[PDB]
Design a protein around this ligand. Sequence first.
Ligand SMILES: Nc1ncnc2c1ncn2[C@@H]1O[C@H](COP(=O)(O)OP(=O)(O)O)[C@@H](O)[C@H]1O
Ligand SMILES: [Mg+2]
Lengths: 160, 78, 244, 170, 131
Amino acid sequence: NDINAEVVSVSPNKLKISVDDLEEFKIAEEKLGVGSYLRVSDNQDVALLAIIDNFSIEVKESQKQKYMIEASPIGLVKNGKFYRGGDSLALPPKKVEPAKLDEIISIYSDSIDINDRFTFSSLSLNTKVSVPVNGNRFFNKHIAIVGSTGSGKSHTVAKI
Amino acid sequence: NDINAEVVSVSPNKLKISVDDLEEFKIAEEKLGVGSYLRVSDNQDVALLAIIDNFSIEVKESQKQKYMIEASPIGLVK
Amino acid sequence: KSFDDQKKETIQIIKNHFQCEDYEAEHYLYSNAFRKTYDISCNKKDRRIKKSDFVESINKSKVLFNIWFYQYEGRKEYLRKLKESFIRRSVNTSPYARFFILEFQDKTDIKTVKDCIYKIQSNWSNLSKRTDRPYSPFLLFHGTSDANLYELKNQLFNEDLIFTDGYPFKGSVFTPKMLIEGFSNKEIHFQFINDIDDFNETLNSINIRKEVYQFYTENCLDIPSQLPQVNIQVKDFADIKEIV
Amino acid sequence: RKEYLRKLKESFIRRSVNTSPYARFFILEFQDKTDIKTVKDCIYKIQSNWSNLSKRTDRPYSPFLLFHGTSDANLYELKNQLFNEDLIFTDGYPFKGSVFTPKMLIEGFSNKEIHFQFINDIDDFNETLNSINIRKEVYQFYTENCLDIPSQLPQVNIQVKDFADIKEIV
Amino acid sequence: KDCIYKIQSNWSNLSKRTDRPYSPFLLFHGTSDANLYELKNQLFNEDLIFTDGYPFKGSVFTPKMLIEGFSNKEIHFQFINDIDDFNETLNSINIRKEVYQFYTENCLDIPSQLPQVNIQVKDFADIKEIV
Ligand SMILES: Nc1ncnc2c1ncn2[C@@H]1O[C@H](COP(=O)(O)OP(=O)(O)O)[C@@H](O)[C@H]1O
Ligand SMILES: [Mg+2]
C-alpha cells in the first residue's frame, strides 16, 4: 500500500517502528513528522496511538531504505473513544498507519466536556482538526505564555 | 504452558528474564508489565519474588522473538 | 409509562431469568425474545402461548435480526453495538483458528462479497515477515451455486489474494493439512473452506483454540456447540463488513 | 538388453552435458497396462536428474511432466500419490474450480520448494508454451502413440519397448 | 552384523553437513526371537543405536518412533520386529518407500504398491558386498 510500517521493538513508554515500503512520499512529509500520530494495531476498532518523538532515515549502497521511527504510546482508542494511559502494551509486530482524522479529533473531544470546550487554535501538523482546551482548567490554573521576540506571543495572548 | 520465562543472568540486585514462548497474550498485558510481581523458583515451595523494572520485546526477520524482562529480587517466599 | 423507562426493566427481568453475564442480556436474550414475541403476536391463528416453552425456544446460540431497532438507531448505530457485543477485540490478537461462515446467495453479487473477504483478511490476520506465529482467517461460504462459488474464488486469485482450500491440484482429494500450514503460512492470505464435509474435517485437525464467527441472512448451519460461536443475522451481505 | 539401453541414453539424452536452467518438457505415454508403481519410479528419476533446487544455486529449474493416453481415474490417483510422498508439484490449478493458470507453472519452475510441474492434457501444454519465455526442450517418450509437437520447438522422440526401460534412459 | 554394518554405512547419511538425513529400515524373518533379541542386544552394545517403536518395556507399537529415528542423526538404523510392525510403519511413512529383499529359501510377501527387488543368495555371507 502507500505506507508499510510496523513495530520492531517496544519499551515501557516507547516503541521503535520500522517503515518498510513508504510508497507515497506525501505520507512521510506531514503524517510521519515529529509529534505526529500513528495507529498501532492489527485491526480497525481497537488501537494504540503514539507521538513520534524521533526518526532516523538511513540510506546506503545496496541494502534497503532504513526508515526507523521512535514513538511513545499516548493512550488507547476503542471504537472511536479515546482512553488516556500508556499502561497498554502492544506485542510486536503491530501494523502502523498514520492516524485518521477521527482519532485525532477524538483525542481532544473526549477528555473535555462539550460545554467546557474552548477552541482558539488548531493542530500544526493537521490543520483540519481543531484543538479545544478545557476552558475551566485553562483559566483557574494560571497561563504562562512564553516566546521569543517576534514569535507571536502577544498575538496569541489577544486571540485567547 | 501459557508462559515460559526464565532467568538467564543474575546480579546482586538485578535479574535478566527471557520469555521463550508467550503462548497466552493476556499474561503479557497485565502480569508482565513494569511493577508486576514475578515468581522466580524451580519448585512450588521456595521462591524469590521480583519487581519488573524494565522490558524489551524485539522482533526481527528470521530468528525468534527476543523478550527480555529486567527485574530485581525483592524477597523470599518459604 | 414511556419506552425509555420500559427499556431497563425488560433488560433486568431477563438478566436473572437465565443467570447470564452482563452484555448477553442486552442483545442476545432481549433481541431474541422481542422477535419471537412479535412472531406470535402477528400470528392470527395462535396468540395464547404459555411461557414454559418460551424459555427453551429463546435459549439458542442465535442472534436474530429485528426490523424495529434497525429503523430506530439506524444502520450506523445498530451495527455499531453489534461490533462491541460479540466481536470485541484487544490490541494483541492471539493466533487463534478463526472460522468465518458467511451466507452467499444469488441476490448478492460478487462485488459486495469481495470486500467483506478483504475486511476479514485485513483485520483477522498477521502475515508479517517479522512475526513467529502468523495466523490467517478461515472462510466458509454456503447456500450458493458452485458456479458462483468458483466465480468468486477465481477473481480473488487475480488480484494477489493467495488462498488454499485443501485441493492443491486438479482431481485432488480433500487434504486438510494444506489448510493447516496455510494458517501458519505468511504467503497464504486466508483459508477458503469449500463444503460442510470440508468444514467438519478441519476442526479435527486443529489443536489450537478455535473460533467461529457466523454472519448469515436466512439459513444457519449446525456448528458443534463446544466451539465458541457467534451467529448473527444480517439483512444483506453489506452489513457483514461493518461488523467484522 | 543391456546393449540396447546404452544406445538411446548416449545418443539423445546427454544428462551430464545439459545443466542449464531451461524449461525442459517430459511427455510420457501412460497406458492402462503400466501400473502406477513404475510411473512413480520414472518421475522420481526425472526430477532427481533434470532439476537443481540446491540452496547454493541462483538459477533453479524443475522439469515439466505431461502424461497422455491414460484415463483421468489413474492420472489423478498418480497425482494424489505423488503429493503424499512430499513430491510437491503444481499444474496450474491452485484451488478447486480454478481455471488453468500458467503463472503458477512460471513461478514453480523457479521455486526451490516445488520439485516439478504437472500438465494434465494437451491444451494445458499448449497454453503454458506461450507463457514460458525462455528456451524450451521437449523430450517425448512413447511406446505406441506419439503426440504432436509444434515445429518451432526443439523436440526429441524416443521409442521404447515399455515403460520400464524409461528411467534408465533418463 | 557385518551385513547390518554394511547396510548402515552404505545406506545412511547421518553427517552434520546435510539437511535431509536418512537411515535404513531393517527387518528379519525366519528366525526365532531368542537369537533375534540376542542380535539386537549385541548391536546396542557396539554403539549402533537403533529403534523399533518400543521405547519402554510393555509398549504398544509406536510407528512415530521410527519416523523420528529416520531423521535422527544419532539413530543409525530402524529395526522392525516382524510382519505386523512392518505393515504398521508402512502406513505411517508418507515419503517414498523401497523394499530390498535378500532371501535364501523363504521369501516374504510385500505389498504390490511398493518398488521391491528380490535377491536370491546361496547363503547370508554374500549379502554383505551386494549392498
Ligand atoms: N495564529 C497565527 N498564525 C500565523 N501567524 C501568526 C499567528 N499569530 C501571530 N503570527 C505572526 O507572528 C508575528 C509576530 O508577532 P507577535 O508574536 O505578536 O510578536 P511578539 O510575540 O514579539 O509580540 C506576527 O507578524 C504575526 O504575523
Ligand atoms: Mg508582545
